[PDB]
Design a protein around this nucleic acid. Structure first.
Ligand code: NA
Ligand code: NA
Length: 326
DNA sequence: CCGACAGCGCATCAGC
DNA sequence: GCTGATGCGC
DNA sequence: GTCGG
């Protein structure tokens, strides 16, 4: 309400940079501007005011001046009207159709879901699945269903092998009221850094979840990452739930908690902890925390047996996932 | 004035 | 057949 | 597009 007109503007501009211009850094640029503006607790009155925010520069300030004085942005209006650009932008909403496939399709007259349905032979497997669940995938997942999806995932994982450790991360683990998908982090004691993976630890879990008909489709699957589709069993009385996106990553046990830390987020929080970790003389990524020598050389990964272990290393009090908004 | 902006697993394409 | 590049999603 | 070396 404060600046929703501005952030919608910037978001639309962002999508067009990503899907049509293929300028991924401009996409993140506009997105970064939209975020910071979303958090500014004042109704912006001028481009110059906005420019004071980190991530808002000259150009976006000019655009805000124009939107403020007129209620629209000329570039955006033109783009909206544009047949090619809007079709290209629309097709990328299909999972598996990126900017390049979307451009190709539109070049050959394929520009609607209907056109996609009429040329299914020109779609790979991932795209067909995305096409199939176009509507369901754009739906959000209420926490209540996320909790009914977790039960299922934790139950069947333990059913396969009770030494398995599984953690539903993402914004769900931070307490969020809804989710966009489900991100599962999987480990097993038999799988470590310098070790075997019994190259079937992941497959086994994916198989069992297919068995009880939770996982309904597969977008991709290897020895360490599964990307797929799942669906809560329908009540017997009422509407069947929409199909959801689920990812499952098998991680080495000695890297599990760094992984859980990282995929729990949030992104802002990961930025801070890693920045703090550096100032404290540690380097933190997805996999490990390592000490930094005097000449800047990273030593071997330190032992980690919980999220808290990491916090202790960099001398900060353990923060609850609920409190990692930033 | 100009390069960074995250980077990696998996599917599939390009090319040998 | 293979390796390496690209597209994609996260 | 924005930031910063
Ligand atoms: Na700024
Ligand atoms: Na897409």
């Amino acid at each position: 309400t404060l600046n929703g007109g501005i952030t919608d503007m910037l978001t639309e501009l962002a999508n067009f940079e990503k899907n049509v211009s293929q300028a991924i850094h401009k996409y993140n640029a506009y997105r970064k501007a939209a975020s910071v503006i979303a958090k500014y607790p004042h109704k912006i009155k001028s481009g110059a005011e906005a420019k004071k925010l980190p991530g808002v520069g000259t150009k976006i300030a000019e655009k805000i001046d124009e939107f403020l004085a007129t209620g629209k942005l000329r570039k955006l209006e033109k783009i909206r009207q544009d047949d090619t650009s809007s079709s290209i932008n629309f097709l990328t909403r299909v999972s598996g159709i990126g900017p390049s496939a979307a451009r190709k399709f539109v070049d050959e007259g394929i520009k609607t879901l209907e056109d996609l349905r009429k040329n299914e032979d020109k779609l790979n497997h991932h795209q067909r699945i995305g096409l199939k669940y176009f509507g369901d995938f754009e739906k959000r997942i209420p926490r209540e269903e996320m909790l009914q999806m977790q039960d299922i995932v934790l139950n069947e994982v333990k059913k396969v092998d009770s030494e398995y450790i599984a953690t539903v991360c993402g914004s769900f683990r931070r307490g969020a009221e809804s989710s966009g998908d489900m991100d599962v982090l999987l480990t097993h004691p038999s799988f470590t850094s310098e070790s075997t993976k019994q190259p079937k630890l992941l497959h086994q879990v994916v198989e069992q979840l297919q068995k009880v008909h939770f996982i309904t489709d597969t977008l991709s699957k290897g020895e360490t990452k599964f990307m797929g589709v799942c669906q809560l069993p329908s009540k017997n009385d009422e509407k069947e739930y929409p199909h959801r996106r689920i990812d499952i990553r098998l991680i080495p046990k000695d890297q599990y908690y760094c992984g859980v830390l990282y995929f729990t987020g949030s992104d802002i929080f990961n930025k801070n902890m890693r920045a703090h970790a550096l100032e404290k003389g540690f380097t933190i990524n997805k996999y490990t925390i390592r000490p930094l020598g005097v000449t800047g050389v990273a030593g071997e990964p330190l032992p980690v047996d919980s999220e808290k272990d990491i916090f202790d290393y960099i001398q900060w009090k353990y923060r609850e996932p609920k409190d990692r908004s930033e």
